[PDB]
Amino acid sequence: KIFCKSVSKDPDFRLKQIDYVIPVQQDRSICMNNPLLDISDGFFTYIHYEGINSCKKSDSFKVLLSHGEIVDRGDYRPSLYLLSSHYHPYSMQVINCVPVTCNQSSFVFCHISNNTKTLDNSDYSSDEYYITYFNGIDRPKTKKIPINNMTADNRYIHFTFSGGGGVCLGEEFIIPVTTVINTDVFTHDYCESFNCSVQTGKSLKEICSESLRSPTNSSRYNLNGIMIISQNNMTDFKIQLNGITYNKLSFGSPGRLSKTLGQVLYYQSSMSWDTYLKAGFVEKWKPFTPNWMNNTVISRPNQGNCPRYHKCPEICYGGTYNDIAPLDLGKDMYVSVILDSDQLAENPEITVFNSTTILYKERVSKDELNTRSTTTSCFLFLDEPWCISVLETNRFNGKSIRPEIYSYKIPKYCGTK
Ligand SMILES: *[C@@H]1O[C@H](CO)[C@@H](O)[C@H](O)[C@H]1NC(C)=O
Ligand SMILES: *[C@@H]1O[C@H](CO)[C@@H](O)[C@H](O)[C@H]1NC(C)=O
Ligand SMILES: *[C@@H]1O[C@H](CO)[C@@H](O)[C@H](O)[C@H]1NC(C)=O
Ligand SMILES: *[C@@H]1O[C@H](CO)[C@@H](O)[C@H](O)[C@H]1NC(C)=O
Ligand SMILES: *[C@@H]1O[C@H](CO)[C@@H](O)[C@H](O)[C@H]1NC(C)=O
Ligand SMILES: *[C@@H]1O[C@H](CO)[C@@H](O)[C@H](O)[C@H]1NC(C)=O
Ligand SMILES: *[C@@H]1O[C@H](CO)[C@@H](O)[C@H](O)[C@H]1NC(C)=O
């Protein structure tokens, strides 16, 4: 509980890159993209997609699933021990996957479909959803989720598991999900309170309603939510689909649930007009109400009319996924690898921040580095706070594309270099 908690320069994160976990592909044309990582109770689950001359998720043919353990090697730092590594049996039909580390095994929740455009012109009854689970010894097993016996809190027509990680609470799995609904049932009191220039075309009430529409169908709305899956031994499933609170709604986007410090932290990537950090601890579960933070310093780059630090409501789409991880509940401290650029996805920086001020930061690379998304997970190691982050990098514009894993420690004292 003793580490740097003040505004300072020159932090010593003791940063180290991990290279033996992520495989190295012999083919230079293959792009390894969209990594996911969830750590819990000393075990982790790593996932990434492989495609040919394209780094798009559904534009793939392989989906890697890795299980491992956190181990002390006497190195005075945590090490990743890879135990099992498998490819998803339905990879060529995977639309999205979310990892969950429960107890001492890996769990992968994937959405499989024949139609890459299923979210724009189809419904969830036309698709299938599976749980693939394994550990260091057991062979991987894939079970189909019975969405037929599912109960929903609203008239949803489609959904996909979308996010950087899930959570295990007792016998229930809670996975972040993005839902689709074809009628405007939503309110926007928070956005309507903004004091911005009125666009000559539409009103502020119209801007915020329409900003929840899909940019590829416009008759559909993308609303974030969670799915609660309880089971005994992959038997007698009870599945519930709850939407996120209508307080401070933002267009559907990949989220995250993480167990940290006795609370449950929810993160939602800001892919619409509110370019500041959407995150918060869970107050109620039905409806899924995270106590949204009022962060005024953490944002993300994007092209178009909503770049970094953009505040005003606007029909915008785009952004980057950047997980956060809490360090101290009383001091309201979090850590995150964010992108230090207004419009381009580049220059990742490890950032320890308040809701109101940035405490300290450090660039990951001295050279300019392209990075499309980051995820961060922190844990106690040797009675000290350590974190592991994965960055979706493209440093070799001439060699193959591959994500990178970094491990670092929160500085014990401020300003040591
Ligand atoms: C794709 O179509 C085939 C034939 O209709 C079907 O067997 C399969 O289950 C479909 N896949 C999904 C995810 O629905
Ligand atoms: C757009 O969504 C509506 C609502 O279900 C659907 O009927 C229509 O086919 C979709 N159009 C496209 C091009 O996906
Ligand atoms: C994980 O272990 C706990 C016991 O501490 C148990 O209650 C829970 O059902 C287990 N979860 C799974 C998915 O096996
Ligand atoms: C806009 O101004 C009003 C006061 O007229 C204020 O109450 C409100 O909080 C402001 N909007 C935002 C988003 O802060
Ligand atoms: C759970 O089911 C599997 C079969 O899929 C079986 O091998 C295993 O022993 C079962 N575990 C328990 C605790 O019943
Ligand atoms: C953010 O501000 C709102 C309005 O004052 C408040 O209700 C909410 O609790 C604040 N967030 C946190 C994390 O306290
Ligand atoms: C960070 O926020 C806390 C309130 O949670 C405040 O007391 C503190 O002054 C802030 N940090 C700095 C450097 O001012």
Residue numbers in the entry: 209 to 625
Task: Please share text taken word for word from the publication where this structure appeared.
Cedar virus (CedV) is a Henipavirus species isolated from the excreta of Pteropus bat colonies in Queensland, Australia. HNV-G proteins comprise a short N-terminal cytosolic region, single-pass transmembrane domain, oligomerization-mediating and fusion-activating stalk region, and C-terminal receptor-binding β-propeller domain. Binding of the HNV-G to cell surface receptors belonging to the ephrin ligand family initiates pH-independent activation of F, triggering a fusion cascade that results in the ultimate merger of viral and cellular membranes. In our integrated structural and functional analysis, we demonstrate that in addition to using the common HNV receptor, ephrin-B2, CedV uses ephrin-B1, a receptor with no precedent of HNV usage.
To assess the extent to which this sequence divergence is reflected at a structural level, we determined the crystal structure of the CedV-G receptor-binding domain to 2.78-Å resolution. Electron density permitted modelling of the entire receptor-binding domain of CedV-G included in the crystallized construct (residues K209–C622). The receptor-binding domain of CedV-G adopts the canonical six-bladed β-propeller fold used by known HNVs. Each of the six blades (β1–β6) comprise four antiparallel β-strands that assemble in a toroidal arrangement and form a central depression at the membrane-distal “top” surface of the molecule. Like the prototypic HNVs, the β2 and β3 blades are decorated with extended loops that form three short 310 helical segments (η1–η3) and three α-helices (α1–α3). Eight disulphide bonds stabilize the fold, seven of which are conserved amongst other HNV-G proteins, indicative of structural importance in stabilizing the β-propeller. The additional disulphide linkage in CedV-G (C310–C376) links blades β2 and β3 at the base of the molecule. The receptor-binding domain of CedV-G possesses eight N-linked glycosylation sequons, three more than the prototypic HNV-Gs. Electron density corresponding to an asparagine-linked N-acetylglucosamine moiety was observed at seven sites. Concomitant with genetic proximity, structure-based phylogenetic classification places CedV-G in a cluster of ephrin-tropic HNV-G proteins, closer to the Asiatic prototype viruses HeV-G and NiV-G than the African GhV-G.
